[PDB]
């Protein structure tokens, strides 16, 4: 299904994922669009940080879910 990834800048990335998709794979998908390094991609959902070794269903994530990506995007 499609999800809404809120990036720290005022952008919402609508990407298509899978229920059994691992959080790490989700990062790769975001990296393909924004180019943000998956390693530095601090994916947080509803305050709870998404662990790379976990899946979307692990955090009860469904379609149109509001995800939040945290990282030092400003740089300086």
């Amino acid at each position: 299904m499609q999800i809404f990834v809120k990036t720290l800048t005022g952008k919402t990335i609508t990407l298509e994922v899978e229920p059994s998709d691992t959080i790490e794979n989700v990062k790769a998908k975001i990296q393909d669009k924004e180019g943000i390094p998956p390693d530095q991609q601090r994916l947080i959902f509803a305050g709870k940080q998404l662990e790379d070794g976990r899946t979307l269903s692990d955090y009860n994530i469904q379609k149109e879910s509001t995800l939040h990506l945290v990282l030092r995007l400003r740089g300086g």
């Binding site: 990036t7 720290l8 800048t9 005022g10 952008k11 924004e34 601090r42 947080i44 959902f45 509803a46 305050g47 709870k48 940080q49 469904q62 879910s65 509001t66 939040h68 945290v70 990282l71 030092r72 995007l73 400003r74 740089g75 300086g76």
Partner: protein
């Protein structure tokens, strides 16, 4: 360069320097970044509580990351729009066509922040010129009046989200002493 709020920092918390040099001088605080950010959360929470469409409403909007303290220490426009708001200043979008159409001389303005997602430019009027500073910029890029007009246009073309601050911004000593420079 006598009394000027020139703070230095590196490694995230970039917003702490952006606000620290927003209104020309310092007045904000690092801990405030989580407070002003939670202001939106506070209102959104009570709003989503009543207008709850799904279960995620009182879940994801009950604990909105960055709003309730950030992990790395970076905040988006969530703290910018609120920072000026609590002081009595307004934020105008100079990049969005629906607003950019106002066509107001940027040299007449007080200060504006440019966002390119990967970087933000902290530009503010100083004395009789415009200065751009950051945590990754020790040299204040002297922006001339004629250059500013082009700079603003270049930003729009590049895709830099220009947040112009309207109203009376409290100037510091750096404004008065900069009046003697060219």
């Amino acid at each position: 360069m006598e009394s000027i709020f020139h703070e230095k920092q590196e490694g995230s918390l970039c917003a702490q320097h952006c606000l620290n040099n927003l209104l020309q001088g310092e007045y904000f605080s690092p801990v405030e970044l989580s407070s002003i950010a939670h202001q939106l959360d506070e209102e959104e929470r009570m709003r989503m509580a009543e207008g709850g469409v799904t279960s995620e409403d009182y879940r994801t909007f009950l604990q909105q990351p960055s709003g309730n303290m950030d992990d790395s220490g970076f905040f988006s426009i969530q703290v910018i729009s609120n920072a000026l708001k609590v002081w009595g200043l307004e934020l105008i979008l100079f990049n969005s066509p629906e607003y950019q159409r106002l066509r107001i001389d940027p040299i007449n303005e007080r200060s504006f922040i440019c966002n390119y997602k990967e970087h933000w430019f902290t530009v503010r009027k100083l004395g009789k010129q415009w200065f751009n500073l950051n945590s990754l910029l020790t040299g204040p890029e002297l922006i001339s009046d004629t250059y500013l007009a082009l700079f603003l246009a270049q930003l729009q073309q590049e895709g830099y989200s220009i947040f112009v601050v309207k109203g009376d911004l409290p100037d510091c000593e750096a404004d008065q002493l900069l009046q003697m420079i060219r």
